[PDB]
Structure formats: C-alpha cells, structure tokens
Amino acid sequence: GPSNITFYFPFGHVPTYGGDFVNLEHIRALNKHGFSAKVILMKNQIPIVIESFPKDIPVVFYKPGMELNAQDVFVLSEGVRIMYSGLAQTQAFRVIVHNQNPFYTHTGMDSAHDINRYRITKIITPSHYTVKKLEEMGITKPMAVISPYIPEYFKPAEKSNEEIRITYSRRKREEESKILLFYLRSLYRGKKALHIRNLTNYKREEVAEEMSKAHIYASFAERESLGLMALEAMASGCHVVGFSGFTDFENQDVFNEENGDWVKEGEYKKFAEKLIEAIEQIENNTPSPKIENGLALVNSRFRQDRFEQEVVRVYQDILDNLPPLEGFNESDKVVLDFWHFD
C-alpha cells in the first residue's frame, strides 16, 4: 500500500545557497510525482523568511511539542550539526543525508566514523565525483546520485558581434581573480578593450540574462561537486575558460578538454592566454567547437525532465528498502521537542 511517509527538509533561513534551491527542486519533483515532501522551518518563523518559500512549497513550522509520524523521513544537509544531535534523541524516523558539499562534511560531523555509525539510510549526492570523494574520506554508507538541473531560462541569446563580454564571479577565489586580471591586462596586446562583468550579488534569473549575452565565462570554480555556474555558462552558449573546480579532475567525468579551456591551479599565465585566444576566436570568426560540446552536454544531462526521473527513481528506491520500524508502529505519533532555538 502507500508508504504514508513524508520527507522533511529542514530550513532555518531564506533559501540562499545553491544547495537550498536544489532541495526545493527535490521537494517540487517529489510532490509532482506522487510523494509527500515538505520544508520544516526550524526557526526564524518571521515574514521575510516565510514569504521566501514559493507557495508551491509546503512549509511546516517547528514548534516543540508538535507530532510527526514515526515512519517519516528527514532529509538532512551535510551541514547543520544540531539536526543530527537532535534526531539522536529518538529512535523514531529515518534519516537521509543530501550531501551537496563534500568538503563541508566537517561542519555536521566530526569524522567518517561518526557518519558510518549514524542511522543514515542513504547519502544522496549531486554527482558521481561526490560519491568518490566521500568514499575517499572513509564514508561507507550507501550512496546515490541526483544531478541538479539548469533551468530552461539559461539558453543563448544575441551576443554582440562588436563588443566581446567576459563574465566571471567573485564568489570563490576573489584574490585569485585579481591575480588573473593582472596577468590578462599585462599580456593582452589586442586593440579592442576588454569588457569584464562580475556576476556576484545577482539573482539566478539575472545571472542567466547576463550569460545569455556574454561570449566568455571566466571560471573561478573551487572545490566543486558539479560546477553549476560553468554548466549555466555552457547552457547560455558561453565559451568557458579557467579553473574547473576539480583538482582531481580525473575523478569527474562531466568536464573534459572538449567542453572547456581548463587550467590547473596557479596557471594564471595559461588562463590569461586562453582568455585572449577565446577573444581572438570571436574577432577572427574562428569559433571554438567547445561551445557546441558544452551546449550538448547540458541539454543532454542537466535539464529538468531527467532530474525529475532521477528524483523519482532514487527516492522510490529508498522507500522500497526501508526496514520495518523498531519500537514503533506505522503512524504512531512522535513528539518533536529536541530543539529550542534562540
């Protein structure tokens, strides 16, 4: 029969980081396809925060003393340590971890050993690379992959045949972007001025607008799981040049020599050189084939329809393999009073 299970995704703030938005996308796909998924808003139950969740995202407020069903599932971030310690206070529920930031695993958990000994049913990740990284850290829990998607509003528009536009972000490696720009100013001896635009405090729709009009995206990616902004750029028809976000580049099989002009750590000269090459490919009308390769990568592997199919497959596979509750029956009510937030 039906599972009678709801998946709860904890929040404590306005959705802000990429990971937050991906979680809302899991919720939407789950509810669209016959599951039940909700935000549990742990704290900061105030207008700006409440109103920040679109109306199609069900929200339940945490209040000490509220009840859930013993069979319900919490889908925890790798961050927020207090959710793990809180849920240790009961043998009810199940726990899934959606680890979207493998290098920030330390914020939630002290070691691989603590993860391995916790009652985690499955770790969902954004990429095959993430699975390998968590395994390298010594985590032995079962893992799954659901790759985020790039919204359809990321797509090429008209790019100026007169003015070449380079976009970048200072979200990561801000100091290194200054080093790079010094090398670029120093090595570039072409006659049209460089037009550089910073996409740092923009909303995602506005990022898409800017990328759609830009020729080149200079990548300052760092310790990525997948590399959303480089995929966004590719989806927008930008030539991506710079850091891949993967020191151990061989451990990911998304980015390759044919879809970007990637450099290794500290290769500022080569980065600047490849930017100049990318400008000249435009000026001399000798386009990089990497643009089309990138477009095809995103359109094949990172759009919404496939994402929804993977959400359904992965979460259904979890439901199908839960063991019976121990020490509870189905739809026993369990009091949640494990947190008291300032």
Footprint of its own copies (CB under 8 A): 103, 105-106, 110-113, 136-138, 175, 178-179, 181-183, 185-187, 223, 247-248, 264-267, 269
The H or E element containing residue 277 is: helix 268-283
Q: Which of 113, 204, 223, 264 binds ligand URI (CB under 6 A)?
A: 204
Residues with Cβ within 8 Å of residue 284, at least 6 apart in sequence: none
* Among ligand URI, its own copies, none, residue 204 binds (CB under 5-8 Å by kind): ligand URI
Q: How many CB atoms lie within 10 A of CB 331?
A: 10
DSSP string for residues in 161-178: SSS-EEEE--SS-HHHHH
Nearest CB to its own copies, comparing residues 254 and 298: 254
* Among its own copies, ligand URI, none, residue 56 binds (CB under 5-8 Å by kind): none
Q: Minimal distance in Å, beta carbon 270 to its own copies? A: 10
* Among ligand URI, its own copies, none, residue 228 binds (CB under 5-8 Å by kind): ligand URI
User: Coil, helix or strand for 117?
Assistant: helix
Number of residues that bind ligand URI (CB under 6 A): 13
Q: Which of 22, 229, 234, 272 binds ligand URI (CB under 6 A)?
A: 229
Rg of the chain on CA atoms, in Å:
22
* Among ligand URI, its own copies, none, residue 207 binds (CB under 5-8 Å by kind): ligand URI
- Residue 20 found at the interface with ligand URI (CB under 6 A): no
DSSP string for residues in 278-335: HHHHHHTT---THHHHHHHHHHHHSSHHHHHHHHHHHHHHHHHHPPPPSS--TT-EEE
The residues binding ligand URI (CB under 6 A) are: 18, 169, 171, 199-204, 207, 228-229, 232
